[PDB]
C-alpha cells in the first residue's frame, strides 16, 4: 500500500542512473522521455486506484523499454526494465490477491447508500423529538411504512440493529417517555424470524463465492506478455462486470420478497436457592460469634430458622398448567393431522371420515370453548386495536425495562409475527366447518390482550423487584476520585510524553508504573479503606515525586504540567429500631401479597378458566414491594443524615442489605417460577395457535 512511495523512489534512483548515463550521450531518444516518465511517476501520488500508479509505471516502463533496448548499449543498463517488470508482476499478484475477495467494495457502497437513508429517516423522526400517544401510533404507522419502504436485505439486519442502536443512543435523551419500550418491541418483532433472510443472504453469498472462485480460478498465471497481459486483464474485467450484474441479480431477491414464512409445528429453572448470609465475613463473623447492634428484641430473633425458612420458600414454590393443556392440544393436533395421512379412497372409506370429523369438531369446539373458557368471544373492540391497527398494536405492546424473560420476548415476537398473518387469515373457517376464522382472529387478540396485561403486570413486578434489588444493593472519597481520574489521564499523558522522547523515559516509564497507582485511582468503582488511604499516600508521594521528576529532568512543559497537577491535587436509635420493625411490616406486606396471590395461583389454580390463576398472578405482580421500599427509603433517609454510632452502624447496615437480599432471593425463587410459567404459557399458546391455524387451513 504505502510501498508505492518506495516503488517511486526506486524508479527515481534508476531514472537518475539512466539520466546520468544519457545526459552527455547524444541520441535524442532516451533522456527527455525517461525524464518525463519519472516526472509522471514523481507527480503521481494516487493510492486507492491501484491501476492509476500502475498505469503511470506502465507508461514509464514503455518509455524505459524504449530508452534501454533501443539505444545506449554502453549507457542504458536495461535491468531496471526487468526490475519494473517484476514490480508489475507483484502488482498483478496484489491485484489477484485483491481479487481473492472483492464483494466488500460494492457491499460497502450499498450499505453506505442504505444507512444514510435510514439516518435521514431517523433524523426526521428524532428531530420531531429534538427541536403524543396518538403521535406514537402515527410514528408506529410511519415505522411500518419505513420497514416496508426500506426493503433491503443485508441492510435489513443493519436496520434492525440500527433500530436497537437509535433506541440506545436516544435512551439517555429525556425527550420521550415510552419510545424505548416501543422500539424494544419493534426491534424484537423485527427480530422474530430474520435468520431465514440471513440464511438466504448466506446462500446467495455462497453462490456468488462459487461464481467468483470460477471467475478467479480462470485468472491464471500469465507471468509474461508485458505488452499483452491486458487480454487476461480485460477477461477478468468482463468476468467482474458480468459477475457484478449476477450478484446484483442475486441480491435482487428482496426482503419484502423474503417477508414470508410458514407454520407447520412448534415445541416448548423452577426454583433457585442462594444464601449470601456468609457473604460479608464480618456479619458472618457475627454469625460465627454487640449490644449496640443487638440491643433490643425486634421479635425476629432467629436467623438460622429464618434461613431454613427462606430455603423452604425456595423449595415449596414449585407449585404452566395452561401451557400443559396447550401442549396436550398441540400433540392432539399433530395426531389429528396424521389422522388423515393415508391414501385417497382407502382413508376416505372410513378413517378420513373420522379424521375430518375430529378436525371439524376440533374447529367448532375451539370456537365454542374459546368463547367459554377464557379468551372469550362476543368482544371485538380490541381486535380493532390489536388484530387491526397492527402498527399501533405493536406500539401498544408495553415493553418492560428489558433469560426466561428473553425467551418469552422471542416467543412473543414470533407469535406476533404469526398473529399478523393469523388476523390476516380472517375468513377461512368454512373449510374448517366462515366468519369463525375472523372470530378466531378476535379470540387470539383477546388472548394476546390477556398476555399483554400480564406483561405490563410483569413490568410492574419487575420494577418492584428492581427497587428491592437496588435497596439490597445500596450498601468517604466517593466522587473525590474525580480529580484522581483526571490525574490518571494526566499520568497516561505523561507516560505518552515519556514515549515522545527523541535515555530517560524509563524513569517516566517507572513513573508510568506510578501511573499504575493512577490506574488504581480509577479502580474500586474494610481493608479497602486502607487501600484508599494507601492510594492517597501514594498520591502525596507522587506529588512529591512529580516535583522530583520535573526537578531532576528539565521537563519544562512537563514542569508546567506537574505544577498544574499539584495545583489540581485538591437519640435516633430506638426510633430506627421501630422503623426497622415497620419496614419489616411493609416487607411482610410485600411478601404476604406476593405469597398469598402466588398460593392462590399455585394450589387453587384449578378453580380458574384461564382467569383466576391469571388474576392471582397479576395480584402477585401487584406485590407491595413499593411499600416495603417506602418504609425502607424512610429508614434510609433516616440513617443517611444520622450520626455514625459504630456500635450499630456499618455491619448491621450491611446485614440489612443482606437480609433484604435474602428476602429478594426467596422472591426471585417465586419470581423465576412465575416467569417460567408465563414464558411457557406464552410459547405453548403460540404453538397451539400455530396448530389451530394449520387446522384452519386444513
Curated annotation (Swiss-Prot):
Compartment list: Nucleus; Nucleus, Nucleolus; Nucleus, Nucleoplasm
Family: Belongs to the midasin family.
Quaternary structure and interacting proteins, as annotated: Associates with pre-60S ribosomes in the nucleoplasm.
Function: Nuclear chaperone required for maturation and nuclear export of pre-60S ribosome subunits. Functions at successive maturation steps to remove ribosomal factors at critical transition points, first driving the exit of early pre-60S particles from the nucleolus and then driving late pre-60S particles from the nucleus.
Identification of the protein by name: Midasin
Species annotation: Schizosaccharomyces pombe (strain 972 / ATCC 24843) (Fission yeast)
Range covered out of full length: 3133 to 3890 of 4717
Amino acid at each position: 500500500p504505502s510501498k508505492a512511495i518506495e516503488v517511486r523512489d526506486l524508479i527515481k534512483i534508476v531514472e537518475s542512473r539512466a539520466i546520468s548515463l544519457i545526459k552527455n550521450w547524444p541520441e535524442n531518444f532516451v533522456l527527455r522521455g525517461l525524464k518525463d516518465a519519472i516526472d509522471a511517476i514523481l507527480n503521481l501520488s494516487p493510492f486507492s486506484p491501484i491501476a492509476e500508479y500502475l498505469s503511470k509505471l506502465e507508461r514509464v516502463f514503455h518509455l524505459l523499454s524504449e530508452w534501454e533496448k533501443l539505444a545506449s548499449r554502453e549507457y542504458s543498463l536495461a535491468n531496471e526494465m526487468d526490475l519494473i517488470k517484476k514490480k508489475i508482476i507483484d502488482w498483478r499478484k496484489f491485484e489477484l490477491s485483491n481479487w481473492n475477495n472483492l464483494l466488500k467494495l460494492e457491499e460497502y457502497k450499498l450499505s453506505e447508500r442504505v444507512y444514510p437513508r435510514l439516518y435521514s429517516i431517523l433524523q426526521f423522526i428524532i428531530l420531531k423529538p429534538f427541536f403524543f400517544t396518538k403521535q406514537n401510533l402515527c410514528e408506529s404507522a410511519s415505522i411500518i411504512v419505513q420497514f416496508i419502504t426500506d426493503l433491503t436485505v443485508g441492510e435489513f439486519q443493519l436496520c434492525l440493529k440500527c433500530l436497537l442502536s437509535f433506541s440506545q443512543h436516544a435512551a439517555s435523551l429525556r425527550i420521550c417517555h415510552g419510545i424505548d419500550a416501543m422500539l424494544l418491541n419493534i426491534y424484537h418483532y423485527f427480530e422474530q424470524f430474520l435468520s431465514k433472510v440471513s440464511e438466504a443472504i448466506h446462500t446467495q453469498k455462497q453462490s456468488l463465492e462459487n461464481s467468483i472462485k470460477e471467475r478467479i480460478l480462470l485468472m491464471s498465471w500469465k507471468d509474461t506478455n508485458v505488452y499483452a497481459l491486458k487480454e487476461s486483464a480485460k477477461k477478468s474485467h468482463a468476468e467482474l462486470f458480468k459477475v457484478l450484474h449476477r450478484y446484483r441479480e442475486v441480491l435482487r431477491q428482496p426482503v419484502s420478497s423474503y417477508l414470508s414464512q410458514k407454520h407447520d409445528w412448534d415445541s416448548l429453572e423452577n426454583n433457585s436457592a442462594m444464601w449470601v448470609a456468609k457473604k460479608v465475613n464480618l456479619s458472618p463473623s457475627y454469625i460465627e460469634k454487640t449490644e449496640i447492634m443487638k440491643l433490643v428484641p425486634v421479635r425476629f430473633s432467629n436467623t438460622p430458622t429464618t434461613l431454613r425458612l427462606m430455603w423452604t420458600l425456595f423449595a415449596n414454590v414449585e407449585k404452566s398448567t395452561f401451557t400443559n393443556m396447550v401442549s396436550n392440544l398441540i400433540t392432539d393436533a399433530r395426531e389429528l393431522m396424521k389422522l388423515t395421512p393415508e391414501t385417497i379412497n382407502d382413508d376416505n372409506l372410513s378413517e378420513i371420515k373420522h379424521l375430518k370429523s375430529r378436525k371439524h369438531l376440533l374447529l367448532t369446539e375451539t370456537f365454542k370453548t374459546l368463547k367459554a373458557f377464557g379468551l372469550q368471544y362476543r368482544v371485538k373492540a380490541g381486535i380493532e386495536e390489536n388484530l387491526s391497527n397492527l402498527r399501533n398494536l405493536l406500539a401498544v405492546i408495553p415493553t418492560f425495562p428489558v433469560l426466561s424473560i428473553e425467551k418469552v420476548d422471542r416467543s412473543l415476537m414470533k407469535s406476533l409475527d404469526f398473529i399478523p398473518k393469523f388476523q390476516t387469515l380472517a375468513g377461512h373457517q368454512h373449510n374448517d366447518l366462515v366468519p369463525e376464522v375472523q372470530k378466531g382472529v378476535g379470540l387470539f387478540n383477546s388472548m394476546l390482550s390477556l398476555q399483554l396485561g400480564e406483561r405490563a403486570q410483569l413490568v410492574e413486578f419487575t420494577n418492584e423487584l428492581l427497587a428491592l434489588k437496588n435497596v439490597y444493593s445500596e450498601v468517604y472519597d466517593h466522587d473525590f476520585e474525580n480529580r484522581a481520574q483526571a490525574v490518571s489521564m494526566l499520568c497516561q499523558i505523561y507516560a505518552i510524553v515519556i514515549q515522545k522522547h527523541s535515555s530517560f523515559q524509563s524513569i517516566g516509564h517507572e513513573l508510568s508504573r506510578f501511573a499504575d497507582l493512577l490506574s488504581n485511582k480509577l479502580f474500586p468503582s474494610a481493608d479497602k479503606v486502607s487501600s484508599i488511604r494507601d492510594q492517597q499516600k501514594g498520591i502525596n508521594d507522587l506529588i512529591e515525586y512529580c516535583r522530583k521528576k520535573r526537578t531532576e529532568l528539565p521537563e519544562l512543559s512537563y514542569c508546567f504540567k506537574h505544577l498544574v497537577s499539584l495545583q489540581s491535587l485538591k437519640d435516633e436509635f430506638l426510633n430506627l429500631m421501630n422503623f426497622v420493625l415497620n419496614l419489616f411490616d411493609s416487607l411482610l406486606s410485600s411478601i404476604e401479597t406476593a405469597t398469598k396471590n402466588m398460593r392462590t395461583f399455585k394450589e387453587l389454580a384449578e378453580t380458574s378458566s384461564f382467569i383466576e390463576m391469571s388474576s392471582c398472578f397479576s395480584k402477585v405482580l401487584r406485590a407491595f414491594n413499593l411499600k416495603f421500599q417506602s418504609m425502607k427509603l424512610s429508614s434510609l433517609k433516616e440513617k443517611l443524615r444520622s450520626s455514625s454510632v459504630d456500635k450499630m452502624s456499618c455491619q448491621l447496615l450491611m446485614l440489612f442489605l443482606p437480609v433484604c437480599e435474602q428476602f429478594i432471593n426467596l422472591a426471585e425463587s417465586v419470581l423465576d417460577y412465575f416467569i417460567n410459567v408465563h414464558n411457557s404459557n406464552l410459547d405453548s399458546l403460540s404453538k397451539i395457535s400455530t396448530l389451530f391455524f394449520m387446522v384452519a387451513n386444513n
